[PDB]
Structure formats: structure tokens, C-alpha cells
Design an enzyme around this catalytic site. Structure first.
Site, PDB file in Angstrom:
ATOM      1  N   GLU A 257     106.603  44.183  40.626  1.00 22.30           N
ATOM      2  CA  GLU A 257     105.274  44.772  40.491  1.00 22.30           C
ATOM      3  C   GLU A 257     105.358  46.252  40.131  1.00 22.30           C
ATOM      4  OE1 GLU A 257     103.549  46.957  42.794  1.00 22.30           O
ATOM      5  OE2 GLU A 257     101.681  46.832  41.651  1.00 22.30           O
ATOM      6  N   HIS A 258     106.318  46.954  40.705  1.00 20.14           N
ATOM      7  CA  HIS A 258     106.437  48.365  40.445  1.00 20.14           C
ATOM      8  C   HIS A 258     107.001  48.563  39.083  1.00 20.14           C
ATOM      9  CE1 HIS A 258     105.857  49.436  44.597  1.00 20.14           C
ATOM     10  NE2 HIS A 258     106.283  50.669  44.405  1.00 20.14           N
TER      11      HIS A 258
ATOM     12  N   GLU B 221     108.832  55.476  49.590  1.00 19.28           N
ATOM     13  CA  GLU B 221     107.538  55.143  50.150  1.00 19.28           C
ATOM     14  C   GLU B 221     107.749  54.355  51.421  1.00 19.28           C
ATOM     15  OE1 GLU B 221     105.220  53.091  47.291  1.00 19.28           O
ATOM     16  OE2 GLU B 221     106.660  51.468  46.956  1.00 19.28           O
TER      17      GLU B 221
END
Ligand SMILES: CCCCCCCCCCCCCCCCCC(=O)OC[C@H](COP(=O)(O)OCCN)OC(=O)CCCCCCCCCCCCCCCCC
Lengths: 76, 412
Positions: B51-52, B128
Site C-alpha cells: 500500500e505504501h 511511523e
């Protein structure tokens, strides 16, 4: 009361519901080994003293009786 | 008078659904039945890292080419991943409908994972995760999922363990991509100013040939999870506030009493106290997420528990009517906006296999009365073992005997 008892940090604590886990998991499986583990860890610090007690007890009783026993030379 | 959601199916298997409305800002979106539930602990962050990276580079659009295109028409590009579904959606104008679909086609197939890009993302994701811990409610809900679904693929997280994130191979990713991106597990959903026939044409041209055949017939399959009542108590007394979530097992997507349970949530001290009905497939978590100062968690728990039992024992018609009215305003629709309507379609075609119209939702709401609400609440809340997840100053949070036992009223 609870909430103000102590300050801990980053100590995660997992647990299970009572009905979800076996009531006596490996009860005699490890219980026996553990109970035996435990005794050998304090047996040398508990029994020794009381052993000598049994001994004094016995010696004491026997000695008394002997004291009551008639002296052979007595009266003879 | 709400327009119906029309669903078609392509040979590939991908379902190109759609919906139409006067609006002119369509949200096209691809939903994929692929999440952290389909990962096998060796690729626990593959969906997140894809997804990233999916947006950053595709074979046809090298480097940041895609993000430029998307800038040229002024469109917005979003993606998200849950434990069961992955979504790539674009909000754009109506007249830019073809190129957007073509863009989405690249994002699902022909995507390019630049080993360099892989590396850059690794940093982004690791960092993150390294700062994600900051968000408490996310930590508490992850703890609740872990302790409620111990030993299953539903305990893991979308992000996955740091290790898996560090160790990822273009090939691993390629696998997840080539394994969980099959055409029969895909929905092309459109909401707003779109024509269904034009979208169906566009679908074939750009989204045909989507893979459908697994490798060596390694056809995935799924496991019905177990709800392990258990608790987790991450104690850290330096935090100013405590977050506590308590849940029980939910019914699932296809079980209609969800609607009744939603009414129960609409019926329901410690700062925030939101009720929730996380509902994965074949299981879910009905419950509550209450934040609170360390000295009131105890009371809150009691209040929460009290409310539930009240709903198991003493539900009246007035609060049921209020909950039905509150639910009937959570109906998603064109007035909710395209993106929301867009999303529903994708989730409805992935979960139910069809788009449930709002009239059927209204019928299922109006058939709910107080007697069946307290029956279903007694079925799902009364004398059940909960999953408890606490984070913060949680010493006065009661342990498992006080919580579970509090779930049964000695007076019924
Ligand atoms: C083979 C075994 C295999 C398993 C081994 C398990 C692990 C070893 C466990 C050994 C026992 C535990 C350790 C221990 O007992 O320490 C020795 C104990 C203390 O010795 P000490 O400090 O000299 O005490 C003198 C007190 N005046 O001293 C003693 O234990 C003996 C104390 C005797 C006291 C007698 C008092 C008699 C008068 C009443």
C-alpha cells in the site's frame, strides 16, 4: 486504594478467562515435581531441628524410667 | 427513489459495480479481499508495505509519474488497508472518468516495486511504527484484537511486527501481490456522476486480464477464528490518560442481527466512551472504548457493564425507537457524499456479495422491537467472556474475575 498503589511502566500482562482454560492444567503432571522440588529446598532447614527433638524426647523418656528402676544394690 | 446499485461481473471475475447520481465528482475505487487475515506471519506487513509502495511507482508510470497525472486533472488519490479489505480509490471529475480507471488499472496490475523505493518505504513504515505507538486508542484496539484472537491470523496487525517490516523482499511482496490480487476477489466500484455502461467498457479495456490463476494451485483458504476471552494490561503510569476497550464476540457480516446490535449501540462518564461493533467475517467484536483518568476506570467499567445488562434485561420501547432513529441517520447515501457511497459498494460487493439498498436496511430496522433486542443482547452480551485491553495508568482497572462476574446480574 487501587489506582494509587504503585507506579510501574511498560509491564504488559496477559491473561485468560477462567472458563477458557483447563481447571487443573497438568496438576499431577508438574505438581508432583514441584512439590518435590520445594521440599528439597527447605527440608534441610526444617527437619534437622525436629529430628533432634525426636531424639531428646526418646532419650528423656528412657532415662526417666531407668531412674524409677529399682537399684539392684539397693536393699541388697 | 434512490437509484439502484447495478453490478456486473467480468470473465476475470472482478466485479465492476457502480452507482449513478447527479453529482459530477465520482469516486472510482478498487476493493480487494486481501488483508492481514490472509497473511501467514512470514509476510505480516506485505499489504501495508505494498500500500505504501503501490502509489510510488508503476511499470508504465515510472517513479512519481502517476502522482503527476493525478495532479494534472486535480484528482485525489487515497488508499487504505484493514484486516480483511484493501482499497485504492480516486476522487475526480466525471469527464476524467476513463484515465482514472486506467490509472487504477496500473495500481492493481503492472505495478512496479522499485527495490530502491522498497527501501525508502521501509524507513517510512518503520519510523511511523516507531511513532505509531503514540496513538493510544490504536494501541488499545490492537491489544484487544491480539488478546481476543490469540493464535489466529486475526490477532496480527495491518502493520505487522517490526521484523516482518524490516525483512521484506520484492519477491515476497510480489507474491502477496500475485497471490491476493485475484480478479474474482476484486470489485471496481463507482459512485456519483458515472454511467454504468461506460464504466463497464472501461473496465474491460484497462482491467481485463487481471490474474485469476494461483500458483501450483496454492489456492488460499480461510480459518474460522476463536474468540479467546482474555485481557492485556499494558501498564505505563507516566501517561496522563488511560484507554480501555472491552468487547465480546460479534456475529459477522452476513448475520442480520448485526442491525439489532447496531440499534443497541445507538442506545449506548469517563471522557470519551464510544461503543463499537467491529465485524470481520465469521466473527466480530461488539464492545466499548472508554478513556478515563486512572481513578474512574473502575466506575466506568461498572457503568458500561450496567448499561449492557440493562439492555439484556430491561429494554423499553422508547429507547429502542430512539436507537432506531439514530441508526436510520447513519444511512450512507449520495448526501453522505461520493467517497462514502463509493466505499459502501466496494465493501458490500466484497462482504455480502451484493449491494443492500437503503429500503432493505429500513425494513430490517423497523422490524426490530424491544423484545428481540433484549433477546439478541442476551445472546451476545449476557454471561459472555470478554476481551479486555488496557493501556496507561490501569492499576484500578479491575481484573478478569470482577469484569466477567459483573456480566451476570444475580437478580437477572
Ligand atoms: C541431593 C540433593 C539434590 C537436590 C538439591 C536441591 C538444591 C540444594 C538444596 C540444599 C538445601 C538448601 C540450602 C541449605 O540448606 O543451606 C545449608 C543450611 C544453612 O547453612 P548455614 O548458613 O551454615 O547455617 C548454620 C546455622 N547455624 O544448613 C543446613 O541445611 C543444615 C542445618 C542443620 C540445623 C540442625 C539443627 C539441629 C539442632 C536442633
Amino acid at each position: 486504594e487501587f489506582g494509587n498503589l504503585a507506579r510501574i511502566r511498560h509491564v504488559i500482562s496477559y491473561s485468560l478467562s477462567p472458563f477458557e482454560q483447563r481447571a487443573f492444567p497438568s496438576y499431577f503432571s508438574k505438581g508432583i515435581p514441584n512439590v518435590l522440588r520445594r521440599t528439597r529446598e527447605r527440608i534441610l532447614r526444617v527437619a534437622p531441628p525436629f529430628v533432634v527433638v525426636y531424639l531428646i524426647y526418646t532419650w528423656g523418656n528412657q532415662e526417666f524410667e531407668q531412674s524409677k528402676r529399682k537399684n539392684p544394690a539397693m536393699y541388697e | 427513489s434512490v437509484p439502484e446499485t447495478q453490478v456486473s461481473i467480468l470473465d476475470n471475475g472482478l466485479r465492476v459495480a457502480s452507482e449513478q447520481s447527479s453529482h459530477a465528482t465520482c469516486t472510482v475505487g478498487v476493493w480487494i479481499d486481501a488483508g492481514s487475515r490472509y497473511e501467514t506471519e512470514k509476510n505480516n506487513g506485505a499489504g501495508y508495505f505494498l500500500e505504501h509502495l503501490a502509489f510510488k511507482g508503476t511499470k508504465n508510470r515510472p517513479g512519481n509519474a502517476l502522482e503527476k497525472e493525478v495532479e494534472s486533472i486535480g484528482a485525489h488519490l487515497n488508499a487504505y488497508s484493514t484486516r480483511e479489505h484493501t482499497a485504492y480509490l480516486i476522487k475526480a471529475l466525471s469527464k476524467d472518468l476513463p484515465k482514472v480507471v486506467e490509472l487504477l488499472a496500473d495500481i492493481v496490475q503492472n505495478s512496479s516495486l522499485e527495490d530502491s523505493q522498497i527501501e525508502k518505504e521501509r524507513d517510512v513504515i518503520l519510523r511511523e511504527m516507531q511513532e505509531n505507538d503514540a496513538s493510544m486508542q490504536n494501541v488499545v484496539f490492537d491489544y484487544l484484537h491480539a488478546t481476543a484472537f490469540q493464535g489466529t491470523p486475526l490477532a496480527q496487525a495491518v502493520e505487522g511486527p517490526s521484523e516482518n517490516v524490516r525483512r521484506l523482499s520484492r519477491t515476497d511482496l510480489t507474491d502477496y501481490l500475485n497471490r491476493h490480487y485475484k480478479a474474482p476477489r476484486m470489485v471496481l466500484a463507482a459512485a456519483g456522476g458515472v454511467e454504468h455502461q461506460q464504466l463497464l467498457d472501461l473496465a474491460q479495456k484497462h482491467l481485463s486480464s487481471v490474474s485469476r490463476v494461483y500458483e501450483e494451485d496454492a489456492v488460499p483458504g480461510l480459518t474460522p477464528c476463536r474468540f479467546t476471552g482474555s485481557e492485556i494490561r499494558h501498564r505505563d503510569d507516566a501517561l496522563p490518560l488511560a484507554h480501555v476497550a472491552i468487547a465480546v464476540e460479534g456475529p459477522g457480516w452476513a448475520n442480520p442481527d448485526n442491525v439489532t446490535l447496531q440499534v443497541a449501540n445507538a442506545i449506548i462518564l469517563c471522557q470519551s466512551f464510544q461503543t463499537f461493533n467491529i465485524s470481520y467475517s465469521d466473527t466480530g467484536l461488539l464492545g466499548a472504548h472508554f478513556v478515563c483518568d486512572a481513578m474512574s476506570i473502575d466506575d466506568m467499567v461498572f457503568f458500561l457493564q450496567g448499561q449492557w445488562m440493562r439492555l439484556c434485561t430491561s429494554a423499553t420501547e422508547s429507547e429502542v425507537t430512539r436507537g432506531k432513529n439514530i441508526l436510520r441517520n447513519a444511512l450512507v447515501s449520495h448526501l453522505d457524499g461520493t467517497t462514502p457511497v463509493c466505499e459502501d459498494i466496494g465493501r458490500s460487493l466484497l462482504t455480502y456479495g451484493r449491494r443492500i439498498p437503503l429500503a432493505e436496511w429500513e425494513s430490517r430496522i423497523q422490524e426490530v422491537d424491544a423484545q428481540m433486542l433484549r433477546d439478541i443482547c442476551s445472546k451476545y452480551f449476557y454471561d459472555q467472556c470478554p476481551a479486555v485491553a488496557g493501556y496507561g495508568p490501569i492499576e484500578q482497572l479491575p481484573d478478569y474475575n470482577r469484569i466477567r462476574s459483573g456480566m451476570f446480574w444475580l437478580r437477572f
